Symmetry: D2
Subunit: 208 residues, 4 copies
């Protein structure tokens, strides 16, 4: 079994992205039988697609789990739908703000996630990790790589399970927002890392 876990580099003035450090910490580990591969994608439209399609070609994983920073979210949000659109409020890391573009012209409006999302969520809960089902992943880079990967799954037969997990801020990133009058929700790094490993595990008890 081969399992891809991606995370992103820091974007829009974040000094840090907790998902980069999750991609890197799950890289090369094995959950029993299954090899896990962890890769960090650019927050750059175009380049992220390119890098993601090479990686899926090269590893050809059975389960792909894409992870992102969802600022101001208070729990682990498990994504239900990727939609065929970019409408970037902020620019990707190269300066490209893209308003109202399809991701794949002619490809479906939307794709549902193939991860067992309610089981993942229920498991997280009995681990005492607060989690819920999100119904929008935005229309920036999370939804973009969440859509391109459910599309390659549909087009090429692999990955077999694909989806997206949004994690809160970690505590160490809150303490300079406090500074400009703001205190967002956070979640410890350790809870987040564990949440994406509990996810990998209910994905494997399902995907055969």
């Amino acid at each position: 079994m081969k399992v891809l876990v991606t995370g992103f580099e820091p974007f829009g003035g974040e000094k840090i992205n907790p998902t980069e450090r999750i991609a890197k910490d799950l890289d090369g580990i094995k959950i029993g039988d299954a090899q896990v591969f962890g890769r960090v994608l650019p927050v750059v439209f175009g380049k992220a697609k390119e890098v993601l399609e090479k990686t899926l070609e090269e590893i050809k994983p059975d389960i792909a789990i894409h992870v992102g920073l969802a600022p101001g979210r208070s729990a682990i949000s498990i994504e239900r739908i990727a939609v065929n659109a970019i409408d970037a409020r902020i620019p990707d890391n190269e300066g490209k703000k893209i308003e109202d573009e399809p991701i794949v012209p002619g490809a479906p409006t939307a794709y549902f996630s193939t991860l067992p999302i309610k089981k993942i969520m229920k498991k997280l809960h009995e681990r005492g990790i607060p989690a819920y089902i999100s119904n929008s992943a935005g229309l920036y880079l999370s939804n973009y790589v969440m859509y391109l990967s459910l599309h390659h799954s549909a087009t090429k037969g692999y990955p077999k399970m694909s989806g997206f997990i949004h994690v809160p801020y970690i505590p160490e990133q809150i303490i300079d927002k406090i500074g400009k009058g703001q205190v967002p929700p956070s979640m410890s790094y350790e809870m987040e890392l564990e949440a994406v490993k509990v996810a990998i595990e209910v994905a494997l008890e399902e995907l055969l």
Copy 2:
């Protein structure tokens, strides 16, 4: 040196209060030289005063730090003011909802906290624990024991340093609010317990 730490029992339909477990975990420990005493107060107007005045009489602490559950807060809130008023929205644990009462008739409108609150906050930050100064402690039981203790300090000469710390929900308490459509901020138990020990330590580097 003697240090009191209080926490409260669960109130208003919480199954758990993280501050009860913090009172109990700091009880009997020693931070160097200083003995720490941890006591859990009732969320019962009247009875909490009684219990708190006996304890301050019996231990006669140099530093008193009172800790409470602040539901929906996203960070450790360090309290600046206790005010002379009850206006309970919900009832205390015995059924007493008290609207617009003074705590001590004739006593001052307000008391400022004697804890080094900005230093505490600054230390918490460099520990990567998100923290801020709160300017209202409500007008229920946190403000009641926060005022009664700044009053005994003013009346009797001890404690020398007194204040209040509000902690978020812990994660294990969020997962049934998710159930009734709500996901509040949470903070890990371990971050909270550490935050109140980093507080005890900057209090002692100050109080001589």
Copy 3:
């Protein structure tokens, strides 16, 4: 030109639904040349589809604008996507909580709204009405009638423009939440009614 405007009856313990009163206030009026029809649908899965398909059959409108109460929203939210799913958190008004059902089995995952949503939003703004594009309509009755209507548009050729608008609470509904410790955003009735007539007007300058 014929224009359908729907609103819903009160649901889940709301004493009132502002959209029922908007359906009823735009009924029978004319914006120039165009006749406007206002109808109130049930918040009852099944029955709402039935009632909505009869109405579209009987009026055969060129523009259909479906309006709902979005509790806790602070502005007029103009909906981008209806998705093929019910996952009701609360029960519809008859007692049916439906978890994970398709609306139309075999029909597309999603439909984009055919209303000129950015122009509507930009117009609202220059009218000083705060408005934004929402990317999820839930998976209760708003998304259900928002999807059934973009599906009849796709299946039957009419309506030509279809979409959904979510309005805040009106002020008179906030004052009893204050009572159980909550104060949600509200918007005046009059701002809301005006917002859906500014919408009808940029829809008609577009739809020929």
Copy 4:
């Protein structure tokens, strides 16, 4: 009877302050028998005190009602306590950020508002205006003029009733926050202006 109503000029990057326009709209009107005077104060520490003490000297009002913009509040908040402290997060309009200063050295820690605040709140509610009792006015300019005026009342015998009202944003100010990714609560200008006149009226049925 003489009634002072103050409002503030725009501060910290607000293009507008709705309270300036309320001070100006109630100026010179009469509620029956009672003359109402409306004055706009600077958001400048020092200068606001000066201007407010001249005005109270010159009008010598029986009721003073001080009104301010509370950004991000969703309802009319009626203030309970002015406290003797500045701790400005942002600078006043002249560049002075003042951290941890007393307003009046030697004067009381706090003052309770003399307005009949629950009656005001109850009346607002039966007018369908959402309103609640706030327990902190910040430690910038609202709390500063809210304290200076409860202090002149205590020192000089007039005003007889004094307090502070915090109003939400008005809608026209929300539409450029939407732009930088934010949509705060708003309240229509008209609801706000009416709320401070319903206040003046329950203050006069009380103050003799």
